[PDB]
């Protein structure tokens, strides 16, 4: 039983030339080696095994922006987003459309500027587009070591260490080395911007910042986490998914800066008589879930993917489809992994799973406790 705080429900929002496919495949690979489905579960304990094992649910966010109801729905199903931009093209209209919806729903996010090895790659230009065009406050947490043909890795500005990923094992191991002499002053300039952003978190840190006292790494990360979750800043990372130089550090960022289910506000809906109500992120609350994808499997038949917001659902329970006005009995429950499919007997608040063989459910339907009815969408 994984506690709620170790969950990370995320979406990888990437369009056009950003490299969504390769980024997603690298995520599943690194997580799989450490120890397309509508939602895939994986585990991550950090690039250097420095964290507890977190359970990451990757929700497939539509690569298209043609079906906007689906984009909005995917943003309520995930809790945090990893937005990927192409280092050459930068911010383009399709990612801009999604970013405005993320803002409308208050979705915290981190950014990964991919393709740092491509001709024309310009990291800081993308960063200025985020600030100027998207109207967010990026906080740069890494600088690339070179660009184009000369791209060798990235620098972690909080730790002030260059990261060298081993070529031979496709980036499964790495080493922290000294920042190259020629980049040291620029790294210090950018690190100061991180302290400045973190200082806004509390009066204690503001005092330390104004007086010139040193921040500890834990203080910095605590502040950046809160600021990210409350949509005040957007941490920015960079690298290359294909070259196996970057996604590993982005995964650490998912853990360190993106929300667990308890970090975001309680979901809002209406009862059957139009009264506004909420469902708390708790096992003690009545069950509620939103169905977000209906897929046909050749082996077991239909798979109904849903996000549970509250309560606990067990195989054999009778629930209510509050949109159709019909009771549904839950049979088998599954969770998809990169290369396997795991049978489970219950799904708790904050998790995502697929129900086998349901009859009444279509996308957007709410499944809930028969006695305490809620409609989460329309
Ligand atoms: O230890 C890595 C991270 O784990 C998360 O579950 C905590 O909420 C963070 O404060 C911490 O930085
Ligand atoms: Na959300």
Curated annotation (Swiss-Prot):
Domain tr-type G: from-to ranges: 5-262
Keywords: Cytoplasm, Elongation factor, GTP-binding, Nucleotide-binding, Protein biosynthesis
GO MF annotation, one: guanosine tetraphosphate binding
One GO cellular component, as annotated: cytoplasm
Top-level taxonomic group: Bacteria
Any one GO biological process: ribosome disassembly
Transmembrane segments: none
Subcellular location as annotated: Cytoplasm
Residues binding GTP: 14-21, 60-64, 114-117
Purpose: Catalyzes the GTP-dependent ribosomal translocation step during translation elongation. During this step, the ribosome changes from the pre-translocational (PRE) to the post-translocational (POST) state as the newly formed A-site-bound peptidyl-tRNA and P-site-bound deacylated tRNA move to the P and E sites, respectively. Catalyzes the coordinated movement of the two tRNA molecules, the mRNA and conformational changes in the ribosome.
Record-stated family: Belongs to the TRAFAC class translation factor GTPase superfamily. Classic translation factor GTPase family. EF-G/EF-2 subfamily.
Protein name from the UniProt record: Elongation factor G
Upper lineage: Bacteria, Pseudomonadati, Pseudomonadota, Gammaproteobacteria, Legionellales
Residues of the full protein shown: 2 to 404 of 694
């Amino acid at each position: 039983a994984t506690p709620l705080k170790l969950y990370r429900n995320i979406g990888i929002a990437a369009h056009v030339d950003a490299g969504k496919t390769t980024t997603t495949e690298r995520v599943l690979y690194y997580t799989g080696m450490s120890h397309t489905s509508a939602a895939t579960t994986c585990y991550w304990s950090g690039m250097d095994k420095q964290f507890e094992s977190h359970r990451i649910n990757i929700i497939d966010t539509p690569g298209h922006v043609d079906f906007m109801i689906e984009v909005e729905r995917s943003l309520r199903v995930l809790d945090g987003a990893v937005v990927v931009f192409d280092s050459v093209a930068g911010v383009e209209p399709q990612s801009e459309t999604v970013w405005r919806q993320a803002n409308k729903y208050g979705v915290p996010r981190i950014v990964f500027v991919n393709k740092m090895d491509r001709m024309g790659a310009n990291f800081l230009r993308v960063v200025s587009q985020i600030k100027q065009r998207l109207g967010s406050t990026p906080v740069v947490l890494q600088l690339p070591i070179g660009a184009e043909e000369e791209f060798k890795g990235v620098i972690d500005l909080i730790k002030m260490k260059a990261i060298h990923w081993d070529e031979e094992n496709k980036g499964m191991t790495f080493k922290y080395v000294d920042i190259p002499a020629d980049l040291k002053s620029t790294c210090e300039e950018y690190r100061a911007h991180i302290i400045e952003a973190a200082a806004e978190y509390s009066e204690e840190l503001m005092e330390k910042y104004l007086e010139g006292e040193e921040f500890t790494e834990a203080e910095i990360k605590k502040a950046l986490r809160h600021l990210t979750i409350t949509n005040k800043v957007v941490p920015v990372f960079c690298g290359s998914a294909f070259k196996n130089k970057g996604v590993q550090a982005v995964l650490d960022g998912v853990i360190e800066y993106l929300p667990s289910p308890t970090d975001i506000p309680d979901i809002q809906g209406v009862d059957e008589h139009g009264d506004v109500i909420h469902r708390k992120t708790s096992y003690d609350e009545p069950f509620s879930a939103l169905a977000f994808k209906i897929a046909t499997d050749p082996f077991v038949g239909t798979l109904t993917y849903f996000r549970a917001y509250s309560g606990i659902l067990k195989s054999g329970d009778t629930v209510y489809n509050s949109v159709k006005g019909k009771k549904e009995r839950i049979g088998r429950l599954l969770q998809m992994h990169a290369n396997s499919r795991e049978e489970i007997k219950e799904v708790r608040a904050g998790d995502i799973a697929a129900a086998v063989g349901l009859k009444t459910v279509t996308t957007g339907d709410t499944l809930c406790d028969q006695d305490k009815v809620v409609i989460l969408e329309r």
